[PDB]
RNA sequence: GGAUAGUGGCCUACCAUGGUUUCAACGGGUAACGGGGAAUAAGGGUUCGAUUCCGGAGAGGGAGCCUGAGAAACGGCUACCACAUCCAAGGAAGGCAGCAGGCGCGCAAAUUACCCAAUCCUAAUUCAGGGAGGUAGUGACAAUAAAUAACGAUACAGGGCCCAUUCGGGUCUUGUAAUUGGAAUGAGUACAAUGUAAAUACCUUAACGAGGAACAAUUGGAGGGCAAGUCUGGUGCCAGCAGCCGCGGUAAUUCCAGCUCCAAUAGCGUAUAUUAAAGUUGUUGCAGUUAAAAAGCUCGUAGUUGAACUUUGGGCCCGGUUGGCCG
């Protein structure tokens, strides 16, 4: 974006999650908006880290365009980022994959159906088959 | 005098003249401006007292 | 469930709704300040009533009472900061002397008109709502936006607007395309 | 002495006197006895649906002379029978036999409006459709 | 003494005859869960509080009880009652006042949707579960801001007034317009990005997106209260209007309409409840000769109220305050 000059404020370091976190703002005059990739690459190069090691979120474009503010989170390693970020944000960043859990209603149906069966039910399957044949 | 039928006498007997087409009046602040010129600067409504809807005398 | 989100009304419709004197007076304000409804007049009068009620409470309070000083200082400070009051009339009784026209005069409509950006107050409102005005450097399109006593130095055309040096609008751009096509 | 007890410990006498005199106040007595709940045809409700039993013409009180158009209607929720004015020109034609109508008050709380003798309610919706909507033709009666 | 985890007529046994009440016991009604609070008020107050917080009580009624630390648990069992489901007719299985949803009831109240991303909770627990909760949908219950058009020139017609070579063009007109121009935009679509658990919206912004027939703002009203019509046509005490007074009986400022106007305006009306107005509930603050109201008169218990009098004044300092003596 034209004249991003991304600024970072309140850059407090947390060794607890081993990262540097700051309130980030981006000035994008004459351009609609800036995206996750373009934000992360610039933040990565200025903080001396890989593109994945830095995380940004919460970008609200302020009225009239011109600039937006989000939250930036640069980790001390890719492994640190992988352990600490939520899976939704990782798949948001493209590093991870969307977990294939079924819908809540189908998932809950499975729970209540298997709740009616005590134990493995392998013997029950054989018995039901024998009676159905009978 | 006296009727339970014929209810709706004049309502059905009126010769219905449809509304005449006319330029739509402005809405909102535009209408308030229209009123302001109508009742303050177009003082041409006074016959001695500031009438608002004089009859076509 | 969640804690309740509080809210309140900002205006008070008048008792005796049809005093011809009040109706004429409020229409004069509406015409000369480019207001859309009587709701704006009611809101400003409700606001003035609230400030006058607080100022009356504190003015009958004993002199150099801690509550009087603290509350009165805060009241006058925000008044002068918004500019409705004036620094020459710094004392508290002048708040009682205030009138609804004073707040209306400091509305964004009339300040745009007074700064000369507007042809009139109604032209001013159209200009504000169409995101062509800006305070500080940011587009503001609430006509009722109160201007502090320091932001008159920043009210001017929005950088995103065609009147602020931006792209030549939409209908002019369309008409320019039509002219080029007709000459093509 | 002004007739009422002035003494400082006489609050009880003043309270019971006020209680004994509150009962002469018309709306307060109605509220406490629950007459609106007990005896009023709507049972305190602002509106009530009913079936029109029959149409009626009611001659107006003096000095007026005319025949206001009303309907004897039996409420759904009580079974009580009520006369209701059909408040517009020719709307008695819209109200047929055996329709379900909505009834509202006349504004004069529990009383009769103007020249209409004894009719304390007015019809609002006919067969679920609005009277003034029918009267200005903004809606059509389903006729079913 | 039992019993209780524990006090206790909580229960048992013997005994005494006590306990509450006109300072309203007891009984009845409540269209009564209590409170923090809500509406509306000069002050006093009046009414409301099922409902987001706290505390109670219930899982259709009622009782009984297992486990556990904690249950009279009901999304746990037992029985009866009332419902109601499937049977292959012997049996079996249930409590939505959880979340959606259906019927009934009514004037009166939404989707059988997405998710654990928050806020928190629970488990053996960083990982799982959570219709708790959040998101979206429905949603004019309420509250916030605020589009429905601005600007120029001529035509139209006067007022300040350069000069009054008037009062001409009318210099600046200010308004009136079937005069005409360019300029701005959003509502809505829409690549995209952000937004999100994923989205939808919001916020941003390429492309598109005003000139009326358009992208059209209604709801009530025009006799008084209460500003707005002595205008026109129709009806002729009929139809109808009208909160009240009243309008209408062939000249309707009130009905049905047209036009014009007025009020509030994405809101406006209507019905009911309630408050101020209401000093028509009157403690502050009513009234009682005649308007409603002084018991027929006296006695009298409860209640309310009830004569004066008991240490005063004067001297002696200290130390705080408004200060002004004094800058």
Swiss-Prot record, chain A:
The miscellaneous comment for this protein is:
There are 2 genes for eS24 in yeast.
Query: Where do we see the Glycyl lysine isopeptide (Lys-Gly) (interchain with G-Cter in ubiquitin) cross-link in this protein?
Result: 20
User: What is the species listed in this Swiss-Prot or TrEMBL entry?
Assistant: Saccharomyces cerevisiae (strain ATCC 204508 / S288c) (Baker's yeast)
Modifications made to the protein after synthesis: N-terminally acetylated by acetyltransferase NatA. Also partially acetylated by NatC.
Location in the cell reads: Cytoplasm
Give the matching InterPro entries: eRP_eS24_sf (IPR053709), Ribosomal_eS24 (IPR001976), Ribosomal_eS24_CS (IPR018098), Ribosomal_uL23/eL15/eS24_sf (IPR012678)
What does this gene product do? Component of the ribosome, a large ribonucleoprotein complex responsible for the synthesis of proteins in the cell. The small ribosomal subunit (SSU) binds messenger RNAs (mRNAs) and translates the encoded message by selecting cognate aminoacyl-transfer RNA (tRNA) molecules. The large subunit (LSU) contains the ribosomal catalytic site termed the peptidyl transferase center (PTC), which catalyzes the formation of peptide bonds, thereby polymerizing the amino acids delivered by tRNAs into a polypeptide chain.
Which keywords label this protein? Answer: Acetylation, Cytoplasm, Isopeptide bond, Phosphoprotein, Ribonucleoprotein, Ribosomal protein, Ubl conjugation
Q: Which residues carry this modification: N-acetylserine?
A: 1
Q: Which GO terms describe its biological process?
A: cytoplasmic translation; maturation of SSU-rRNA from tricistronic rRNA transcript (SSU-rRNA, 5.8S rRNA, LSU-rRNA)
What gene does the UniProt entry assign to this protein?
RPS24A
Stretches with biased composition (Basic residues): 104-114, 123-134
Q: Name the segments for region: Disordered.
A: 101-134
Q: Name one GO cellular component term.
A: cytosolic small ribosomal subunit
Q: PTM Phosphoserine: at which residues?
A: 13, 55
Q: Does the keyword Methyltransferase apply?
A: no
Gene Ontology molecular function, alphabetical: structural constituent of ribosome
Which family is it part of?
Belongs to the eukaryotic ribosomal protein eS24 family.
Fetch the PROSITE patterns from UniProt. Answer: RIBOSOMAL_S24E (PS00529)
Q: Does the keyword Ribosomal protein apply?
A: yes
Swiss-Prot record, chain B:
Identify one Gene Ontology CC term for this UniProt entry: cytosolic small ribosomal subunit
Sites of the modification Phosphoserine? 12
Report the GO molecular function annotations.
Answer: structural constituent of ribosome
Keyword Oxidoreductase carried by entry: no
Enumerate the PANTHER family for this protein: 40S RIBOSOMAL PROTEIN S30/UBIQUITIN-LIKE PROTEIN FUBI, RIBOSOMAL PROTEIN S30, ISOFORM A
Protein role: Component of the ribosome, a large ribonucleoprotein complex responsible for the synthesis of proteins in the cell. The small ribosomal subunit (SSU) binds messenger RNAs (mRNAs) and translates the encoded message by selecting cognate aminoacyl-transfer RNA (tRNA) molecules. The large subunit (LSU) contains the ribosomal catalytic site termed the peptidyl transferase center (PTC), which catalyzes the formation of peptide bonds, thereby polymerizing the amino acids delivered by tRNAs into a polypeptide chain.
Record's subunit section: Component of the small ribosomal subunit (SSU). Mature yeast ribosomes consist of a small (40S) and a large (60S) subunit. The 40S small subunit contains 1 molecule of ribosomal RNA (18S rRNA) and 33 different proteins (encoded by 57 genes). The large 60S subunit contains 3 rRNA molecules (25S, 5.8S and 5S rRNA) and 46 different proteins (encoded by 81 genes).
Q: What is this protein called?
A: Small ribosomal subunit protein eS30A
Source organism: Saccharomyces cerevisiae (strain ATCC 204508 / S288c)
The beginning of the lineage is: Eukaryota, Fungi, Dikarya, Ascomycota, Saccharomycotina
| Gene this chain is encoded by | RPS30A
Swiss-Prot record, chain C:
User: Which InterPro entries does the record associate with it?
Assistant: Ribosomal_uS4, Ribosomal_uS4_CS, Ribosomal_uS4_euk/arc, Ribosomal_uS4_N, S4_RNA-bd, S4_RNA-bd_sf
Q: Where is this cross-link: Glycyl lysine isopeptide (Lys-Gly) (interchain with G-Cter in ubiquitin)?
A: 179
Reply yes or no: does the keyword Thylakoid apply.
Answer: no
Q: Give GO MF terms, alphabetically.
A: rRNA binding; structural constituent of ribosome
Where does the record say this protein resides? Cytoplasm; Nucleus, Nucleolus
Modification Phosphoserine, positions: 183
Q: GO biological process annotations for this chain's record?
A: maturation of SSU-rRNA from tricistronic rRNA transcript (SSU-rRNA, 5.8S rRNA, LSU-rRNA); ribosomal small subunit biogenesis; translation
Assigned GO CC terms: 90S preribosome; cytoplasm; cytosol; cytosolic small ribosomal subunit; nucleolus; nucleoplasm; small-subunit processome
Q: Which domain of life is it from?
A: Eukaryota
Checking SMART domains in the record gives: Ribosomal_S4, S4
Key words of the record? Cytoplasm, Isopeptide bond, Nucleus, Phosphoprotein, Ribonucleoprotein, Ribosomal protein, Ribosome biogenesis, RNA-binding, rRNA processing, rRNA-binding, Ubl conjugation
The residues covered by the S4 RNA-binding domain are 106-180
Q: Where is this region: Disordered?
A: 159-184
Q: Name the NCBIfam families on file.
A: PRK04051.1, uS4_arch
Misc remark for this entry? Present with 106000 molecules/cell in log phase SD medium. There are 2 genes for uS4 in yeast.
Similarity annotation: Belongs to the universal ribosomal protein uS4 family.
Q: What is this protein called?
A: Small ribosomal subunit protein uS4A
List the source organism: Saccharomyces cerevisiae (strain ATCC 204508 / S288c)
Q: What is the lineage of its organism?
A: Eukaryota, Fungi, Dikarya, Ascomycota, Saccharomycotina
Curated annotation (Swiss-Prot), chain D:
Q: Where in the cell is it found?
A: Cytoplasm
Carrying 3,4-dihydroxyproline, the residues are 63
| SUPFAM superfamilies for this protein | Nucleic acid-binding proteins
CDD domains named in the record: Ribosomal_S23
Primary localisation category? cytoplasm
Q: Name one GO biological process term.
A: translation
Q: PROSITE patterns in the record, alphabetically?
A: RIBOSOMAL_S12 (PS00055)
Processing after translation? Hydroxylation at Pro-63 affects translation termination efficiency. The stereochemistry of the 3,4-dihydroxyproline has not yet been determined.
Matches recorded under Pfam families: Ribosom_S12_S23
Under the GO molecular function aspect, what terms does this record hold?
structural constituent of ribosome
Task: Tell me the impact of changing residue 63 to A.
Answer: Lethal mutation
Q: From which domain of life does this come?
A: Eukaryota
Q: Tell me the keywords, alphabetical order.
A: Cytoplasm, Hydroxylation, Isopeptide bond, Ribonucleoprotein, Ribosomal protein, Ubl conjugation
**Gene3D superfamilies according to UniProt:** Nucleic acid-binding proteins
Q: Where is this cross-link: Glycyl lysine isopeptide (Lys-Gly) (interchain with G-Cter in ubiquitin)?
A: 55
- Please provide one cellular component term from the Gene Ontology annotations of this protein: cytosolic small ribosomal subunit
**How does the record describe its quaternary structure?**
Component of the small ribosomal subunit (SSU). Mature yeast ribosomes consist of a small (40S) and a large (60S) subunit. The 40S small subunit contains 1 molecule of ribosomal RNA (18S rRNA) and 33 different proteins (encoded by 57 genes). The large 60S subunit contains 3 rRNA molecules (25S, 5.8S and 5S rRNA) and 46 different proteins (encoded by 81 genes).
Look up the further comments and give them: Present with 10600 molecules/cell in log phase SD medium.
Q: Which family does it belong to?
A: Belongs to the universal ribosomal protein uS12 family.
Name the chain's protein: Small ribosomal subunit protein uS12A
């Amino acid at each position: 974006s034209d004249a991003v000059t991304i600024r970072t404020r309140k850059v407090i370091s947390n060794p607890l999650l081993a990262r540097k976190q700051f309130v980030v703002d981006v000035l994008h005059p004459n351009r609609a908006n800036v995206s996750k990739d373009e934000l992360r690459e610039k933040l990565a190069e200025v903080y001396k880290a890989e593109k994945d090691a830095v995380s940004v979120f919460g970008f609200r474009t302020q009225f009239g365009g011109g600039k937006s503010v989000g939250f930036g989170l640069v980790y001390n390693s890719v492994a640190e980022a992988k352990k600490f970020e939520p899976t939704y944000r990782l798949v948001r960043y493209g590093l991870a994959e969307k977990v294939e859990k079924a819908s809540r209603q189908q998932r809950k149906q499975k729970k209540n159906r298997d709740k009616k069966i005590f134990g493995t039910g392998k013997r029950l399957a054989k018995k039901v088959a024998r009676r159905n044949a009978d | 005098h006296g009727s339970l039928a014929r209810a709706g006498k004049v309502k059905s007997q009126t010769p219905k003249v449809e509304k005449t087409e006319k330029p739509k009046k402005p809405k909102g602040r535009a209408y308030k401006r229209l009123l302001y010129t109508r009742r303050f600067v177009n003082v041409t409504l006074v016959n001695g007292k500031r009438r608002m809807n004089p009859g076509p005398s | 469930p969640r804690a309740p989100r509080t809210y309140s009304k900002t205006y008070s419709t008048p008792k005796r709704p049809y005093e011809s004197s009040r109706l004429d007076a409020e229409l004069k304000l509406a015409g000369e300040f480019g207001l859309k409804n009587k709701k704006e007049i009611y809101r400003i009068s409700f606001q003035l009533s609230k400030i006058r009620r607080a100022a009356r409470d504190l003015l009958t309070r004993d002199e150099k009472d801690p509550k009087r000083l603290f509350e009165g200082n805060a009241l006058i400070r925000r008044l002068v900061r918004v500019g409705v009051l004036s620094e020459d009339k710094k004392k508290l009784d002048y708040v009682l002397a205030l009138k609804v026209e004073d707040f209306l005069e400091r509305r964004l409509q009339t300040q745009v008109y007074k700064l000369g950006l507007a042809k009139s107050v109604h032209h001013a409102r159209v200009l504000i709502t169409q995101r062509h005005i800006a305070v500080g450097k940011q587009i503001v399109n609430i006509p009722s936006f109160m201007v502090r006593l320091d932001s008159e130095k920043h009210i001017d055309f929005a950088p995103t607007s065609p009147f602020g040096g931006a792209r030549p609008g939409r209908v002019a751009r369309r008409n320019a395309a039509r002219k080029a096509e007709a000459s093509g | 002495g002004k007739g009422k007890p002035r003494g400082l410990n006489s609050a009880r006498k003043l309270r019971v006197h006020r209680r004994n005199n509150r009962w002469a106040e018309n709306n307060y007595k109605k509220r406490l006895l629950g007459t609106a709940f007990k005896s009023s045809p709507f049972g305190g409700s602002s509106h009530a649906k009913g079936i029109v039993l029959e149409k009626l013409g009611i001659e107006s009180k003096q000095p007026n002379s005319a025949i206001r158009k009303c309907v004897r209607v039996q409420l759904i929720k009580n079974g009580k029978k009520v006369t209701a004015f059909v408040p517009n020109d020719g709307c008695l034609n819209f109200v047929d036999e055996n329709d379900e109508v909505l009834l509202a008050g006349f504004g004069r709380k529990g009383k009769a409006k103007g020249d209409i003798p004894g009719v304390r309610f007015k019809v609002v919706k006919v067969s679920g459709v609005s009277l003034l909507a029918l009267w200005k033709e903004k809606k059509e009666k389903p006729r079913s």
